[PDB]
Each structure stands twice: as structure tokens, then as C-alpha cells.
């Protein structure tokens, strides 16, 4: 009935109104009168959240939520908890800080995001190590909150493999600005493929150190996921050829294509509502009162977001809200340090690449 | 010459505490018997 949209300043608003009109005239012609309110911003700001969110909750109790920003702050998707729990309105995170999945989805969270699904990150990273037979590792993470998770993923999913991956240990840099202890721990790298799980500025630091360590040689290889790439629009200087990331970027997609896809996901969830109910639990009224309780007596979309299919693409979601058939655009930096299309994972989560083994090519 | 015959054709009659080395030594011996390097010494 109502979908709210807050974006980064990008492709414009009347463009999104035309996208909504084209999605409405496309297919699944909606006995629910779906009406969408969209805006373009640039803020990571909670008063903007209070103004926009509470004024749209005052206005006709808007039921759908789409968020593709031009941002990078990971905790914004974690701060969507109070929208998911103080409105109980389902949330869609496509780009920006809403894309950055570090919020392990709570039973009070109503999160469904097009962002970089973590378990699928680990499995796709291992299948990247499969498909060019790079069995010899070196593992460097840091102790950002949530990387011990990835340490557990690497340990279990190698130990659950009969492949027998050649393991060099997870070299966790403790704090930033050590600059002598980091070089001691990074002279411990004695293999070819170096797997990084860090931030962006720490990646600047580690590449500046490893260009002195001789580890950025171009028989070494560097497969660093969307924690460091993020915006492909931002190409900083010290990031050479052969940097390999896994991200749900609009190279293979556009903004409005994913807009129409996610609105279709919401309308199949609403059609499953109209199957299993004939009424809808409305959104809340105000941010400033708690009238009776938070009793969800009409049972919002978490069983209804289970089964979603569109146009030959299963846009259904798992129990923790991650994509059952994911997109997973695998993007490799080249000589010109350009984020280019290499791999896909849309067909039974199988790789779709260029068979180009050599990528570190004298940047 | 080996006219000196022992007991039968191989018929054999009569058929530190608290060290943490014991697991290491015994799993190592499982590896060597599983690899047959004792047979190489043989």
C-alpha cells in the first residue's frame, strides 16, 4: 500500500516515480493500491531519521521501506533495529550504509537487504580459491567487531572440507598505528595469495607497508572482499591490479531495476498476506507514544518473506534474511585499476568467470 | 648357513606417569604405522 524510500543523492526522484509507474504497469497488478514516497539525501544523521521517519509514520502509516544510499557507515544498518522494532515495518537495504551487513538479524529486526551476505561471502571466497586451485593461503584479518566470526567461518569451512587447504594462520592485526608490530606480524606472510579482511584506511596502511615488504609483487594475489572495495565509484591510489572483491554492485544491475525487484518482493509478500489473511497489520502512528502494546496479532512478513520468486530469479530469503539465490558480482581491479565485471553466482551459486588466471599485471 | 632353527616358524610365546607426551607419541606412531616407515627401518 505504501513504500518509503530514502536514498543517497543519485539518480533522481521523478525518475523513481517513473520506475514505480513502470513496475506498476509491468506485472502482478496489485489489488493493494501501492503508493511510494521517495527522497534523496546524503546524511548519516539520526535527526534526519527522526524527521523523515516520524513524519512519514504520521502520514498514512507507510508500510514498505527501500534504502539505497551512497554511504559506507556499517552501523546505519545496525541502527535500522529501532525502525524494525519501533515501527515493526520491514526494511530493504540495497546500497549505502543500509547495504553494509554487520547486523545479525534479530527476531525483532525486520531486515531484508541486498547487501554482502556473510556466510555466502565465506563460501564464495572458498570457491574462488577452488576455481583457480589456489590451495596455499595466507590469512590476515583485524579485530574489528565481527571478524572473529570470519575466523570461525574459515576454520570450520576448511575443516568441513576434504580438499585439504594449505593453511597459513589468521594474522590478526591488533590495533591501528602500531606500525612496528604490524610489520612484524606481516613479515610472517610467506605464501602467494593474501586474503585480507580489514577496513579501507587500514588497507591503505597494509598496502603501503607491503609495498615495502615485497608482498605486493605481481605473482602474489590479492582477493579482498566488499569490506574494502565498497563504492566502485571511489578508486583510491594505493590499490593495485589484481584486487578481487565480491559485491552486489549495479554493474550487472541498475538502481531502478533493483527498486522494481524489491518492490516486487514486497508485493509477493503482500500477496501471501492476502492469501493467508485478508487484512494487514498497519504501521504505527507516532514516535512519541506507546498506546497498548507491541502485540503483532496479525503476524507480519517474516513467514511471508520466505517464498519470493520473480521473473525466473528466486528473490526469496533465508531464515537470517540472506538471499537464497544471490547475485554476487565478483569484481577484479586491472592495470587501469578499474572495477570490472568478472564473476557471477546467480546459477545455483556457481562461478561465471573469464578464465583469466593472471590478474596482477604491473600496476 | 642358518641351520640354527629358533622356536617354530615364528611361534612367539608370552604373546613417566603423567607426561602429556603420550598423546603426541601415540598419534605420531599411528601416523608412522599408517605410513609404514617402521617397515622402512625393517
Amino acid at each position: 500500500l505504501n513504500i518509503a524510500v530514502m536514498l543517497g543523492h543519485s539518480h533522481d526522484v521523478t525518475e523513481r516515480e517513473l520506475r514505480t509507474l513502470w513496475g506498476p504497469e509491468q506485472a502482478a497488478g496489485l489489488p493493494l493500491d501501492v503508493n511510494v514516497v521517495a527522497l534523496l539525501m546524503n546524511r548519516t544523521d539520526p535527526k534526519s531519521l527522526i524527521t523523515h521517519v516520524c513524519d512519514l509514520m504520521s502520514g498514512a502509516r507507510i508500510h514498505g521501506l527501500v534504502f539505497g544510499d551512497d554511504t559506507d557507515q556499517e552501523a546505519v544498518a545496525q541502527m535500522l533495529d529501532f525502525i524494525s522494532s519501533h515501527t515493526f515495518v520491514p526494511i530493504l537495504g540495497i546500497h549505502g550504509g543500509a547495504s553494509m551487513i554487520m547486523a545479525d538479524k534479530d527476531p525483532t529486526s525486520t531486515f531484508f537487504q541486498f547487501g554482502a551476505s556473510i556466510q555466502q561471502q565465506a563460501t564464495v571466497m572458498l570457491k574462488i580459491m577452488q576455481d583457480y586451485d589456489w590451495h596455499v593461503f595466507s590469512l590476515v584479518t583485524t579485530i574489528f567487531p565481527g571478524y572473529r566470526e570470519f575466523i570461525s567461518f574459515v576454520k570450520t569451512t576448511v575443516d568441513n572440507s576434504f580438499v585439504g587447504w594449505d593453511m597459513q594462520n589468521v594474522i590478526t592485526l591488533d590495533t591501528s598505528f602500531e606500525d612496528a608490530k604490524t610489520q612484524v606480524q606481516l613479515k610472517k606472510i610467506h605464501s602467494s595469495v593474501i586474503l585480507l579482511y580489514c577496513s579501507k584506511d587500514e588497507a591503505v596502511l597494509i598496502l603501503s607497508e607491503a609495498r615495502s615488504l615485497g608482498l605486493t609483487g605481481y605473482d602474489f594475489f590479492w582477493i579482498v572482499p566488499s569490506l574494502v572495495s565498497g563504492n566502485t565509484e571511489l578508486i583510491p591510489k594505493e590499490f593495485p591490479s589484481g584486487l578481487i572483491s565480491v559485491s552486489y554492485d549495479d554493474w550487472d544491475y541498475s538502481l531502478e531495476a533493483r527498486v522494481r525487484d524489491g518492490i516486487g518482493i514486497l508485493t509477493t509478500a503482500a500477496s501471501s498476506m492476502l492469501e493467508k489473511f485478508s487484512y494487514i497489520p498497519e504501521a504505527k502512528a507516532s514516535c512519541y507514544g506507546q498506546m497498548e502494546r507491541p502485540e503483532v496479532p496479525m503476524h507480519t512478513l517474516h513467514p511471508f518473506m520466505v517464498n519470493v520468486t520473480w521473473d525466473g530469479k528466486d528473490l526469496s530469503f533465508t531464515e537470517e534474511g540472506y538471499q537464497v539465490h544471490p547475485r554476487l558480482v565478483v569484481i577484479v581491479l586491472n592495470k587501469d585499476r578499474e572495477w570490472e565485471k568478472v564473476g557471477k553466482w546467480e546459477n545455483h551459486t556457481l562461478s561465471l568467470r573469464h578464465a583469466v588466471w593472471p590478474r596482477y599485471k604491473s600496476f | 648357513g642358518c641351520k640354527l632353527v629358533t622356536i617354530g616358524s615364528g611361534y612367539i610365546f608370552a604373546t613417566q606417569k603423567g607426561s602429556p607426551w603420550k598423546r603426541q607419541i601415540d598419534l605420531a606412531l599411528l601416523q608412522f604405522v599408517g605410513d609404514g616407515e617402521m617397515e622402512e627401518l625393517e
Binding site: - | 610365546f13 608370552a14 604373546t15 604405522v33 599408517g34
Partner: protein
């Protein structure tokens, strides 16, 4: 034909927190030393030929 391939011993399935590895293995030492191994060699092993 052939030698004994993978020369191991025939042991007993015992959990790690089982406290009775001790006196059972002492009885195993008694079975080797007092020929109870040889007693099962008599009573079940060594009967038949062709």
C-alpha cells in the same frame, strides 16, 4: 597371501572419560603374560586345517 598390511592392534572402544582404561589394560597385560591370549588361541583359533 601377502604380509600383514597396516600392522595395528585390536583394541577396545573406550571413551576418553572412561576411568576403567586402567585395570582393564592391567587384565590385558595379565592375558598376554599368563597366556589368556593363548587360551583364546586354543579355545577359538587353533582347530582347523585343509
Amino acid at each position: 597371501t601377502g604380509e600383514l598390511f597396516f600392522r595395528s592392534g585390536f583394541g577396545i572402544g573406550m571413551r576418553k572419560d572412561s576411568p576403567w582404561k586402567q585395570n582393564v589394560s592391567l587384565s590385558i597385560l595379565k592375558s598376554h603374560e599368563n597366556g589368556f591370549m593363548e587360551d583364546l588361541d586354543k579355545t577359538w583359533v587353533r582347530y582347523q586345517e585343509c
